[PDB]
Amino acid sequence: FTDTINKCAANAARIARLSANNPLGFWVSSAMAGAYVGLGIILIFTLGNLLDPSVRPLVMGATFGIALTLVIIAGSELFTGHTMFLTLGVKAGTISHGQMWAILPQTWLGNLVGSVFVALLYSWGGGSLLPVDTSIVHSVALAKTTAPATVLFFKGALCNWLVCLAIWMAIRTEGTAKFLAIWWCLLAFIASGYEHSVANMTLFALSWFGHHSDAYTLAGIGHNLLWVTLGNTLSGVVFMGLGYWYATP
Amino acid sequence: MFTDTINKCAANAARIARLSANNPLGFWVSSAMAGAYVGLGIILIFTLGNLLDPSVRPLVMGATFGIALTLVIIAGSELFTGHTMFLTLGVKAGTISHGQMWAILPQTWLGNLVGSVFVALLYSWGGGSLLPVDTSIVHSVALAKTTAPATVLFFKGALCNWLVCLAIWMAIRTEGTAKFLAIWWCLLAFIASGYEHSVANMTLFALSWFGHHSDAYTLAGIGHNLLWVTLGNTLSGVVFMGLGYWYATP
Amino acid sequence: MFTDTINKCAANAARIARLSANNPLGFWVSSAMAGAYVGLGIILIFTLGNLLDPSVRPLVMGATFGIALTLVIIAGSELFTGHTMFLTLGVKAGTISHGQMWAILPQTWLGNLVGSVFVALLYSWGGGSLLPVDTSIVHSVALAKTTAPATVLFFKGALCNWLVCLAIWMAIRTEGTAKFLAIWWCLLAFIASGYEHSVANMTLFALSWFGHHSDAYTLAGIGHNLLWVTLGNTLSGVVFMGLGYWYATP
Amino acid sequence: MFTDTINKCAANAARIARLSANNPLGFWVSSAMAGAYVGLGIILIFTLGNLLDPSVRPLVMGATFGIALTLVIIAGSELFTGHTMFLTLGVKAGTISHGQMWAILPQTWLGNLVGSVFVALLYSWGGGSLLPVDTSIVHSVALAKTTAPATVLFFKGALCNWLVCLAIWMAIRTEGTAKFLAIWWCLLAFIASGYEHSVANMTLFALSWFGHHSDAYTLAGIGHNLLWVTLGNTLSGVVFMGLGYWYAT
Amino acid sequence: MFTDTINKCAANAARIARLSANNPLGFWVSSAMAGAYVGLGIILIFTLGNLLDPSVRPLVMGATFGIALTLVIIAGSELFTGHTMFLTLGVKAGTISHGQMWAILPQTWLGNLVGSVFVALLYSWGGGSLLPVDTSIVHSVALAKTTAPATVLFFKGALCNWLVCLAIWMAIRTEGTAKFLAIWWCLLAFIASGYEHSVANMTLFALSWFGHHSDAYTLAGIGHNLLWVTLGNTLSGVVFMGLGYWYATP
Known part of the structure; x- marks a missing residue:
């Protein structure tokens, strides 16, 4: 898997140059990924909302794929993807540890x-x-x-x-x-x-701007984002990044 | 990359401009084509939708609408909502003027x-x-x-x-x-x-207009919708897509 | 755009012409093939539609009719409805004469x-x-x-x-x-x-004819549909597509 | 020249003859595989049609049988019903004789x-x-x-x-x-x-034979269907397809 | 026929034998991945199946299981059941020894x-x-x-x-x-x-074991299945596919 590792490493170095040399481009490109995933969430929730509970997983899962398709094919910068690219970039030596931790929160915010x-x-x-x-x-x-x-x-x-x-x-x-x-x-x-x-960012924002109940809070949103974010980072960094790094000759 | 895509978009913008200036009959036929192709797709989804429960209309109408932009792009034709993106990029890459952009758009719309x-x-x-x-x-x-x-x-x-x-x-x-x-x-x-x-909507509205439509459904109502929808279509074509990708490139 | 596609249709029309005149037998085999292939499609979708509720018949019968033209195009055959377009573009490009187009279309139809x-x-x-x-x-x-x-x-x-x-x-x-x-x-x-x-429709008509159809169903009825459906097929092939794309090329 | 597709069919007929004549073991293996592969598709469609209302069987069983000929063509094997076509084109193209064609077909059917x-x-x-x-x-x-x-x-x-x-x-x-x-x-x-x-049918009949069939289901019955269906199969492969496309060019 | 494929598979056994001998860490990771990947596909289909009428479970669970082997092959990993085929062919072609096949096989299994x-x-x-x-x-x-x-x-x-x-x-x-x-x-x-x-089955079993299973579900039972299905799996890998295509070539 050295080819796939190098392409990811080349990508980590690209993310960095964008971050450092083209701030406007980076932010637009990060905001894009959130909008694109969000368009998918609006699609799947629209369809799920009309359907019996027992078919929601099937229809919502089957129709969510647009979300990452847009992200990857249309082009954009997706935090959850960065966790892997940036790990590989760090491990190969195309970017540094410090650059990794400085970029991730940025992609997260955009x-x-x-x-x-x-x-x-x-x-x-x-x-x-x-x-x-x-x-x-x-x-x-x-x-x-x-x-x-x-x-x-x-x-x-x-x-x-x-x-x-x-x-x-x-x-x-x-x-x-x-x-x-x-x-x-x-x-x-x-x-x-x-x-x-x-x-989740789009889901929470949709609920915030609608008739959510009292028990739905900014804190509860903070709670979910904290813990999902860390867990996404675990799999991106360790299962995939370190995982495949250690799997190749 | 992003720059490659943009250049193709700007080349297409110069190609539409010429088509408009040099071959008006082709510009109009191609324009009429895109409207008809989207409508054939509108006839399809509405015929299917009419036989379904509300709760499965969006899914089946959505899953069967693909033919519309498929015809427009693969068969070839000129689509107004598409121009909003291409023309912006042509203006910004320099291959057409701001002037040509706003002169073309209402032509495509009418076609x-x-x-x-x-x-x-x-x-x-x-x-x-x-x-x-x-x-x-x-x-x-x-x-x-x-x-x-x-x-x-x-x-x-x-x-x-x-x-x-x-x-x-x-x-x-x-x-x-x-x-x-x-x-x-x-x-x-x-x-x-x-x-x-x-x-x-231009297809859907003409279908309703030609059938036994509601006495509440008017040319003014059609005008109200096509106006704000068009302006809306235009905002995303020009700003989220045309300008959006322009500023995303290093 | 469209010049390459048009030239391909035009080369196809000369090929159809060469086939008709130089190897009549292969002309008929290859026309019979298209009717038979389209038929195997019609049997499929009527079998399926025959068991379903009327409300899902258009969806299912539509979604499964694809094989018909897939056979015609990918296996290879001669289909009168496609000939209406090909031959038009052929006359327009100069690869065949008006005369050749009208001598051929009725043959393809008969096959x-x-x-x-x-x-x-x-x-x-x-x-x-x-x-x-x-x-x-x-x-x-x-x-x-x-x-x-x-x-x-x-x-x-x-x-x-x-x-x-x-x-x-x-x-x-x-x-x-x-x-x-x-x-x-x-x-x-x-x-x-x-x-x-x-x-x-030819296959559908033959299937009902060979089966237990009502007395209201006659050869005059069949000829009535085939006349107007054929003339209508010919309109869109010749004009909307043939002549449409001909005048769309810059 | 002939058409590419006819020349390919006919190369395929010559390759069949050679396998038959020089490599009996290979032939029998490779014919056995095709029967097993079509059989795997048959178990699939009958397992699904078993649970379904008769009105959706032809659709679901039809829509899911494609694996049968997919295995035969993509995995690789020798299918009787396709030989009827290949071997006709070989004969017309000159790559095999009428003699090799009729000697091979029953071998394919049995394997x-x-x-x-x-x-x-x-x-x-x-x-x-x-x-x-x-x-x-x-x-x-x-x-x-x-x-x-x-x-x-x-x-x-x-x-x-x-x-x-x-x-x-x-x-x-x-x-x-x-x-x-x-x-x-x-x-x-x-x-x-x-x-x-x-x-x-060979697999359907073998499933029913080896399972708890009614005594109305007999070896002569199975033989009756196989005889007439094999003959019909051969009519269309030889004539509608081989002779048909031979004369189409 | 099949010679290229056999040889790809044999070249794969040799790659496997090399990973095992010179990179045990990488071996183990790549084995574990395959097991985890299959398990993802298992968690999907059972979650889907659980909410469905039993009469559509085989269809839906079957139609959605594809991800399992897709992850294995396309992301890349080492799958025991695949190994039964790869190694057999490498043994036959001479790219690995009998000795290697048997040392590696239970390793992939454990991973x-x-x-x-x-x-x-x-x-x-x-x-x-x-x-x-x-x-x-x-x-x-x-x-x-x-x-x-x-x-x-x-x-x-x-x-x-x-x-x-x-x-x-x-x-x-x-x-x-x-x-x-x-x-x-x-x-x-x-x-x-x-x-x-x-x-x-390994994943399905682990899942049950970590959940609210009845007393009747034991390790001896998990054992019984893992034994006999592994062995059956090995039969078709080795004999029906390995020796099967091997003896199917001129």
Whole structure:
């Protein structure tokens, strides 16, 4: 896997030059990834909200794949992806430890602005997920904000294993195969109940700007984002980055 | 890369300009084509939607709308919502003037209308089953689209053309079947999410207009919708996509 | 754009012409093949539709009709409805004469009919389950097609061949799998929207004819549909596609 | 010259003759595989059709049978029903004689029969759930196939192998995934239209024979269906496809 | 025929033998991955199956299991069940010794075990919904698997790995998305037919064990299944695929 490792390492060095030399480009590109994932979340929640509970995992997982397709094919900068690229970049010597930790929070924030931005436009566009309190947007958001730390951490680990696996298979494949790679892993992660930090940003923002109940708070959103973010970072850094690094000649 | 994609977008912008200036009959036929192609897709999804529960309409209408941008891009034609992106990029790369951009756009818009109205007419002469029946989802959706407020329609128009331009963008960055999938994804996301396409609406509105529509459904209502939806489509084409990618490049 | 595609259609038209005049036998085999292939498609979707609720018949029958044109294009055969486009572009490019176009089209038509009647015969001798019951959708759909007004039939036939020629067009402009997707989309769209395919009707008509059809179903009814559906197919092939794309090239 | 596709069919016929004549073991292995592979598809579609209302069987069983000819063509093996076509083109092209063609065909049919019986037996030792209930789908369909009339069976086998060969033919004229979709289309059209495949039947009949069939189901019955379907299969492969495309150029 | 593929597979055995001898860490990781990857596919299909009517479980669980071997092959990892085929062919071609095959084989097995157990464990710590409710299909499918007769499990294992090696074999002989379709088809077929995969069972078992299983579900039972399905898996890997294609070549 030295070819795939070098391409990821070349990418870590590209992310850095963008961060350092083109600040405007970096921020636009990070906000893009959040908006793109968010457009996917609006799609899957719209469809889930109309359907019986027993088919939601299947339809929402099967139709979420647009989210990473946009991110990877359209082009953008996705925090959860950075956790792997930047690990590989550090391990190969194309970027440093300090550059890694300085870039990640930046991608995280741009993703956030882009998520809030798409949920805002959806809200001004009078989106139908928003005004009714029984909307799946609110009950999924609330449940997400009140789950224990451990549960959220490990769900965040599992999600980013798959999402990074999708990034990884897409770099190793061509044409349509990238699309199937993306499709598969997004099905597995949504249907299986795992947690994606950047997907959550849009979900939480959608619930915030609608008729959420009193028990839904900025704190609870903070809680979920803290622990999912760490767990996404575990799988990205260790399962995938260090994992494949240690797997090659 | 990003620069490669942008240059292709700017070359396409210079190509549209010329087509407009040098070959007007082709410009109009190609424009009429895009409107008709989107409408054929509108006839398809509305015929399917009319036979389904509300709770599966968005999914099945969304999953079967892909043909619309597929025809526009693969068969070849000129689509207004597409130009909003290409022309911006041509202006910014320098291959066309700001002037040519704003002179082309209303031409593409009108051409599309001609094809949209044209395909709705044929369908009507063709005893299309969606027109005469006052309970059809053609009349009800077209009614709701005409009386939604401006802000709502604007922002749904913005969200629609982000996605449709993303399809355009992604089809250019990819090859063979990947093109059909990118298009598929984005048309499913836009339809199922509730967003608004000016050009597709031109077909839907002409279908409702030619059938037994609500006495509440007016030319003024059609005007209200096409106005704010168009402006919306334009914001995302120009700013989120055209300018957005322009500033993302190092 | 479009110059390469047009030249390919035009080279195809000369090839069709050479085939017709130099190897008449292969002309007929290859035309019979197209009617038979389209037929194997019609048997498929009527078998499926025959068991489902009327409300999902357009979706299912549309989604599964793709094989028909996939066979025609990828296995290789001669389809009258595609000939309407190819030959038009051939006359326009100068590769064949007006005279050659009109001498050929009726032959392709006749060959398609032979292959159609023929695949229907085999299905019958094969004790196909669609035939013996009066309630079969083969009988109710064939009869509805035969008593429909000329006007309705024409414009539906025009709308159909737009879509089928669009599939042929897009297939010429793409490679590998994308051909199959282009074809799938267009056949979803024409069948599910209600549109009329002249050659595909030939098989349906023969299947109902060889089965337990009602007395209301006559050869005059069949000829009535085939006349207007054919003329309508020919309109969209010749004008919307042939002449359309001819005047669209800068 | 001939067409590329005809020249390819005919090279394939010459390669069949050589395998038959120089490598009997290879031939028998490679024919056994095709029977097993079609058989694997048959177990699949009957396991699914078993749980489904009759009105969705032709659709679901049709839509899921594509693996059968996918294994045959992509994995690699010798299928009787495709030989009828290949060997005709060889004969017309001059690469093989009428003599080699008629000597090979029965060998292919038998090796296919062996692999079909072999995969049935494994499934049967594997406690296959389709076996014990004489009223469930393998036994009722198996029974009705053995008592159908000769004319009906012959013309159904004609229309089946038209489609199965059209799949073979289109797979030769295409690359990559297009081959898979060609095959998939064709096996949906033949299984859902009610058409009969001699080799597919060999596994169905072997499943019903080795399971708890009613005593109305007999060896003479199985022989009755196989005789007429094999003959119909041969009519369309030889004539509609081989002779058909031979005279189409 | 098949000589290239055999030789790819033989060259793969030699690569495997090299990883094992000069990079045990990399070996173990790459084994564990494969087990964890399969386990992800298992967690998916059981989560889907659990909410569904039993009459659509084989279809849906089969149609969605594809990710398992797709991760294995396309991301890359080392899969015991694949090894049974690779190593056999390398032995026959002379690229590895009999001695190597037998040293490596239970190594991959253990690594796959460690990985399957590992993903199960993460899913337990992440409050996986499949675990706590006794009637969950993770528990009932797990139990039925553990008490089935040796002979039954053996021949279901042989038939499973026939299919899985066929996917791997077809993936080797194809490109691009085709690798993906070959895999999807084989995993549909094996999961929906009732066949038994040793490594996937490893995850399913760990899951049950970490959840609310009945008293009747024991380690001896998990043992019984892992024994006989592994052995059946090995039969079809070695003999039906390995020696099978080996003796199928001129």
